[PDB]
Structure formats: C-alpha cells, structure tokens
C-alpha cells in the first residue's frame, strides 16, 4: 500500500519525490539562508532562518551556506532543517508510514553514514531506510547492466565501471572537482574583464551565468586563436539590477578545467584522463563493452559540447580499432532519482529494506553491512 | 532402439553427442566460473555459477576453475556440474534411458573409475555405462588395428602400443607435459618482450595465442639463428583491449617443451624419445609394424610442423633400414570421440556394459573386473 | 687495486656505496621533482629538475616522478639523471675508472637490460659492470648456500629458492604486489575517517604513516573484533603543518593486502601462499632444507608481527612434522647491497667482471649472455 519516496540529496540541488513517477516533485538548491543585517519592522514574518526557494528569492539580505561540502555533510542542523521543509512543506506527507531511499557518493566519510542513519530513524521516525550509490542508479535509469558512469555533481566527480551488475571496488575513481570550483574559477577569470563578484548572491548569479552561457570547446587553441583574432563568440548577459555584461573568451575557459586541472592548481590528471585510468584499471577482458557504454549523469554534464570533447579524447587516448560511444540523454540531470524509481518498484529489492528493528539492535552500524 | 551417449570428458574440453554421428555436437571446455567482484545491481537472473561456453562469455568477472587436472577429477561438485550441464542443456537428453561411454587416460588411480562409477549410476540412473581408454578409441578411428598411439591432451601425455588388438600393458607411457605445461611456459616467456599475464582470466588469451600463432621448428639452432639474424619470423596479435603485441622467436619457443621438457626443470626425456624408449619396450617382432604405425592424436598435435619433426627425430634414432610413418589426419583432435562412436555402435560390443544389476550386485568394483 | 661501486637501483630508494664496506653512503629515494607553479623570483638558483633528498624536501611545489614502476625503467632520462647524481653529487666518484654493480629483479622484461648495459658504457664509460639478482645477493648476505628468499622492494614481491647455491628458475616465483599498492590501498582506506589525501606530494606522508604506525596482526578476525569492542589500538600521528590525525584498525588492515590480495581486486594469491607453492614447485628431496631457510629481505618485510604470521601460516600450509624457521635479520632492508659488496669483493669474481672490450665486440647483447 505504502509509496517508497526517494530523496536525492546532491551538493547544490535537492530532487524529493514519490517512487515509480517519471519526474521529481520538487527540486530545489539545499540551501540555509540566515539575515546579516538588522530589521526595523515589528512583525513583517521575520523567521530567523530561510530554507529552500524562499532563501534563494531573498538573497539580498541573506548569508547563505551550503550544508553539504564536496558531497559530505559538514551542518547536520542545517540538513535536518532541510529534510525537515522537503518532508513537510514541500511534499506535505508523513514520514512514519514511507519507505525512504538516499544517494551517496563512492569513498564517502563512514561516519556521514551512521549520523544519517541515526539523525532520521530517531527524529522523523521512518520505517525503512536504504542508502544506494549514484552510479548504480545512473545505471538503473538508462536501462542497460553494462558500463562505466561518470557522474558530476556539485561537488563530487566520480567515475564507476560496472560490468554484468558486477561493480569493481578498485577501480573507483573519486575527484573533488566540480561546479563549485568551476563557479569561483569564473568568478577569478571575470575580474579581468572588471566585474567583481564576492558575495553569496553573486555566486547564484554567477552559477546562474555558468549555466545559461558556458559550452565546452571541441579544440581549445584553435578557438583560443579565434576568439583573440574575431570578435563573434561574445555574448551579452542582462544582471538582475540592470546592468549587461558582455563575456569572450571565458564561456569556454570555464568547463576547460574540468579537462586541465591545473587552472584551479589541482595537480590530479583531467577527466579524460581519469576515465581511461579507470578502464584500464578493470580487467583485461571487459575494456572493450566499458569502451562502448560512458553513461553520463548530473548537471555538470549540461554543457553542450562535452560528448563531442570527450569522444575525441578518449579516441585519442585509446588504440584506434576500438569503437567508441557516449550515452549522453537529455534528460541526464535527474537521472540518479530515476534510478530510484526503478529500484524502490522492484519487489526483488522490498526484502533488503533497513526496517526499524534490525536498527533496534544492531545500532547505526547495520548500514555498512546491508547498504553496499 | 535406444542410442548410446558418447561424451569424451578431457581435461580442458569435453566432447559430448550421440553414438553413429561422424562428429560431436556439444563440444566446450571444461571449466567453471565463480563471482569474483561485488554484485550490486539487484535481479537479472545473477548466477552463483556459470559452466562452460558463457562462463568464457563472461570471464573478466568470473575466478575460473578447471574441475581436471592432469587426467585427476579433483572438485566432484563441478565435475558433477559440468555433466549435469552437458546431459540436460547441451545435448537435452534423459540420461536415465541411454548408455554413456566415458573416456580416460592410462596409469590413473583406481578411485577415479570407482566415482565415475558410483557418480554415474546413482545420481544420473543410467541404465548402462561403460570406460575406455582414448588411445584404444584414437586407433579405432584411425581405422587400422596395428600401431602405437601418441595423445596428448590438454593434462596428460600418453603412449599406447598395441599390436593385432592385444595391447601391451608394461610398455605403456605416462608424461604429465601437456598444453596446460605449454600455456604456462608460454606466459613465463612473455614477460621478455615486456608483456604481463597473471590472472586465470587471461590465460585463455594465451591460449589462444598459443593455438593460432605457434609451429614447430625443424631444426632450432636454425630457427633460432634466423630469428635473431632477421625480423620475417616475427608475428602481431589482437588483444581484445586493443592493444597490439608481436612475438618474434617465442612461437617455436614454447612447443620445444614437448621435446626439451628440461626447459620447465622436468628431466624426463621428450616425446620423441618417449616413442622411442616405448617401441624398444615391446616385442622384438613388432616393431617393424610400429615404426610404420606412428599413429598421432589430440589437440597439442595439431601444431604445424610437428609431424616432420617427430619424423626426423625417430629417423635419427631409429637404424637406417626402415621406413617411418606418421598418420595424421587433419581431424584427429577429434578422434577420441570418433572411435567412440565406432565402439558403442558394434553388436558385438553390446554384451560387455556395465548394467544397473551387476553394478547392485557388485559394488563400484565391477568397473575394474569389466572395463579393461 | 681499484674499488668496485655497489649501486642498489630499487624501485623506491637507491643505495649506492663502495664494496667491501658494511654500510651504503648514499641512500636516497628515486625521486624526479619538476616545479608546477610559476617562478616570480628573479634568480634564487632556480632549476629546472631536482633529485633525491632536495626533491624531497622542496616537495609542496613540485610534481614528483618515479622513473622505475614496478621493476621496469619506464623514463630513461630521469634514471640518467638520478645515475648522474649519486656518481657525481653523492659519492663524489668520478666513474671512469671504478666499476660498477647493479641489482635486478627476475623475470623483468630483457630490453631494459641492454639499456642498463648501454648508457653505463656509453655515457659514463664505466671499465666494467655486473648484474646481480637481488635473492642471490640476499642469500650472499646472510652468510649460507642454502635457501628460498622472499623479496618485496616498493615495486616487486618475488621468491627464489636455492639449493646448495643451485637456483631452480621454473620456481621462480614474481607477485606484482609491494609497497607503492600498500601506499595506495592506505590512502584509499584513510577515507573512511574523513582525511584525504589526492596529490603526490602527499603520498610521502602517507608512506611515512605506514612505515611508523603500521603492523602485520597474528590473526585477523579476532583483531578486527578487538578494534571494534576497544580503543586500545588507536594511534595519532603528526601532520607537517600541525594537524593530527588519529588511526584505528587501519593499522593491520594496509600490511594484511600481502596476505589477502583481493582487497585490491586482483585474482592471485598471498605471499604464504605463493612461498607454499614455490616449496611444492620444487624437488621432493630439498624441501627438508627449504621450510627452515625462510630468508626475508627488503624494506616490506620490516613490519613488525611478520615472521610470525608466515611462520603460523606456513605452519598451517605444510605438514605438521615439517619444522619451519624464518630468519629476519634486523639489517635485512640493506641485505642487497651488502651481499652486492661481499660478492664485489670475493676473490674468484674477477673473471666475469662484463668488461669494455667485450661489450665492444658483443654489442649490447653481452649481458643475457654473461649475466645470468
Ligand atoms: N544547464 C546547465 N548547464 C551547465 N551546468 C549546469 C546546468 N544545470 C546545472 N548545472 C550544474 O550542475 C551542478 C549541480 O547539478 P546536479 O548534479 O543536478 O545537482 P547536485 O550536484 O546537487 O546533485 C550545478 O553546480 C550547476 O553548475
Ligand atoms: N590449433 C591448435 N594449435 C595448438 N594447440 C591446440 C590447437 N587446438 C587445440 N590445441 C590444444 O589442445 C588442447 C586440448 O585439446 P583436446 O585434446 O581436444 O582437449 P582435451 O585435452 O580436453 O581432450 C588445448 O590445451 C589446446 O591448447
Ligand atoms: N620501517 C618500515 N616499516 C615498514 N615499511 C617500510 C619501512 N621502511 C621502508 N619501508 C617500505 O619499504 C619500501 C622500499 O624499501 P627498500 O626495499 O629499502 O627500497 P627499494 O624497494 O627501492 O629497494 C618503501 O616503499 C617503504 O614503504
Ligand atoms: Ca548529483
Ligand atoms: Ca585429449
Ligand atoms: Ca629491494
């Protein structure tokens, strides 16, 4: 009788919603917003803290923080008022008769896991609880049992080769580079052009900027090259008070450092890089299905022209006679919470379930043996 | 009415099909594969076991292990499995209303026949078996009755000489130097050009690069001064990663074990020296007729080359004033079954099988009173 | 009347020193440091490459490089270089006219070797040189003519048995298993408390920590369950900037990869195991003088608990009225060079001494030749 819900929980954005639907009910930046200036008026629904869309409307007089840091929980206050408004402001049900699945990046802090498996069957008082990685619901949603996924979040760049429902645990590949580096390597590249962005609310706007107007360069020289000599890759952006900015060459400078790190200083290889290390990390005999499956999910994957970069680098890194293809659908950013509506509609998953009993005397702890 | 099921059961394939046919239908190797890796997709039919022809399918996730080892059935759960597999999958027959011929090598111990025995009439229920020798079966397909046969599978190396039908059991020969031994001396020479092979997974590769790239030599110091003076006998191979090796004097390398068998520390003497010592071995009469007979059989025969090396050897060792003859068919890797197909299909051999009573009645001992 | 050098070219450190001495003078490890930031100082005797110990104490703006992975000499001229530097910077040698002596790993690919011979000749024109196996030296250094020896550098784990100074090659045994895969797992396991560790640099810290802290357990399990019930066996440790990290059940969990190797997903067996089976490999007389030889050599095997746990898990593997001693010599991380300078030393060794003459006429093909 009971609905599953499914709650994925990223770095930046937070998708709620029922199992077995095709789209989330709600999705919103987890975010808390606190107000850094004093007020005047008596009454005027002053709240003392700001939760989701609404802190994202008022920003202007609002500190914000993000309670998740490169995919770990480091506020737990602030994340059980998150769960807290997408439980019951936004998807206006009652915790105690649902089941409720959880997204976690691989190489995760274990002690993120027994707080969150404590700070939910103690409060909002859950029947059932599972706990799942990404990439495994990535490939949930795209329908196949073979391939390696690379999935970008905010904060957490993974990539996980699974072969026949087969995961190989060595070959897990963790960077801690994604959007929010790339958001303050676009707020260093415009001070260039003379537009100071400081401020959390500049950081939406240039997270906003980053969204509607980066593409990644197929060849990043030649279009160097031409964005220096002609005047045609410019565009125009309109801020929200009223100014315009006009931006070159630096709507493909920004997504060029998740394929040279060393922009940002990080000395690790780039994403390319990282991806066939991975397939060569995995046994001799599976290369070549994980060169035909890249399974792409998470907005940082948004930025158009990435599947075109990334099959000529992967083709450049591997022996030619290989076929190379990247599955790249458009509707890949809500793609891990489709997984979970494949996984919570099973009936073969509805055993391996962490019911409220196996808690009661096992402690936190039952989560590292039935989840993963 | 009633057609007798002939299976050679070798160490690394088994041959398995009906008595009357020219050739076998189910033919796979034996092997059996376990998960190595961790399952994490849930459903989809996830085997805690796969036998033959998918577990090679599948072998880059999958421990893989070889239930015979030099002609010694080992792990009886597997063996068991891999004729459950070959009785009700492959060639989709009830077991319980055909007789069974079973294959064997000389010079094997004596609870081999009695579990074959006791496994066969109690857990399948056939209703008639019988055990044979494969060097008896090779000079039954090779159509005449005077010789000594040569066959060398893929665990065991054994020589038979047999003269108007009557055997002669003292002069029987036993070499555990077979394609396993070759396979395994071709991986420790590999790693000089630099190439790595460990992992059960890709010993099929070698295998492979064993069965399509080596020859035998003529004469070695030859070859091996030509190999170093010049690059024509070098050779290039696909591996299914892409990547692409080339050996040069490795090819003839690796079968010069079957006559240098001290290059793996074996002090035994080679092949040809075997015949030798075996034909010497019997009568002095006879061995006019067998040196015309040399009959060969098995898979590590079908090298190119060997025939006119094996020819050379035994003319050199052998006085002057005879001829030698070698028979190799182009189909005798087959030929331990083909025989048995002959064998089961005589009326005048469907009085010697083992019955269900006489097995009631005599325990798994009956084998070693009936068959030979 | 001349002085033979003794240069230990290991994966991870070189020792380089004069024969007949009891103690390396240069110990370094084999570290190409090149700068990754920008140079905004005007002169400050900058450079463009740094070596040994002043790569390793300049390392928070550098990108280090091991020339050597696993055996094998992968960059040629960072090798040049690091030979450059312990000839002329660290011992203070002028090798035109001393000799040289160097250490291998078996079973290492052949064309390394001929480049080992070339540019020792070509460019710093030594009048002789040797190449030594590194168990043989090991078994030189602990004084007897009987034994197997267990290897494990930073990149190589290999056994080698010896019988009356008669070494079995198809015995040898090579396990690409060492410390950089230990530095490796430990970095990836470090995770789980929350402490990361990404770049190269780094990699020496958490080399240091598993040199300090870590300890092969007796026995795993109850180990495990008195970490878990306890906190007796938490242990912190210093960070270089000020920061203290504290470690708990990692400590036994990082050495016992030597003994279960698919925690790091590779199919192969332990090094008991691996020992086990070189012993069986062997003649069925000599293993009496083979189970109370265990020799122990390298910087891998100074954990301590080691000896014990190979003697209960080779007293496990053979059988029970076989005596089993291992010997591990307090000095056995610097055994190789110190049988290198005994075996320089010896009186009769003077005659296979690869001299400049013989190189002359032989090219480089004179050392699989002399060599081995
Ligand atoms: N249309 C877009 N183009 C480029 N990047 C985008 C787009 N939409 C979202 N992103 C980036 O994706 C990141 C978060 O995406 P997502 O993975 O869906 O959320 P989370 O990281 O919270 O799971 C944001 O930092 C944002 O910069
Ligand atoms: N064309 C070939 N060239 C070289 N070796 C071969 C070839 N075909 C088969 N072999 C070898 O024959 C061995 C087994 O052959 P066979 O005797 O038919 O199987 P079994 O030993 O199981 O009875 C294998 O180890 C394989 O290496
Ligand atoms: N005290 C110690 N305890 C544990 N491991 C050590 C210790 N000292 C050195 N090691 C390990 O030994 C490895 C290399 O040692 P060594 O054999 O001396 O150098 P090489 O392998 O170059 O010959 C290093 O990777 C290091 O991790
Ligand atoms: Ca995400
Ligand atoms: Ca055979
Ligand atoms: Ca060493």
Redesign the interface.
Known sequence: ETTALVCDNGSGLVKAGFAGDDAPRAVFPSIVGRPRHQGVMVGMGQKDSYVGDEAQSKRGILTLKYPIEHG?ITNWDDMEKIWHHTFYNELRVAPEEHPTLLTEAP?????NREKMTQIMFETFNVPAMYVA?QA?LS??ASGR?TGIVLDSGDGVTHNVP??????????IM???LAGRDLTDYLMKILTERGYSFVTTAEREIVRDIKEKLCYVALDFENEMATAASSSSLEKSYELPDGQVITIGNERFRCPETLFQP?FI????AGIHETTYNSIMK???????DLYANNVMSGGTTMYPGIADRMQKEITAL?????KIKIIAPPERKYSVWIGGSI?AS?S??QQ?WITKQEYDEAGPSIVHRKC?
């Open positions: 770990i190489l995760n802090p274990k002690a990685i495994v490939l949930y049992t699974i072969y026949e429902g087969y995961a190989l645990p060595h070959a963790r960077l801690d060393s200083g990080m000395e690790s995995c046994d001799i005999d599976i290369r070549k591997a022996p030619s006679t290989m996984l099973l073969t998953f391996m993963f």
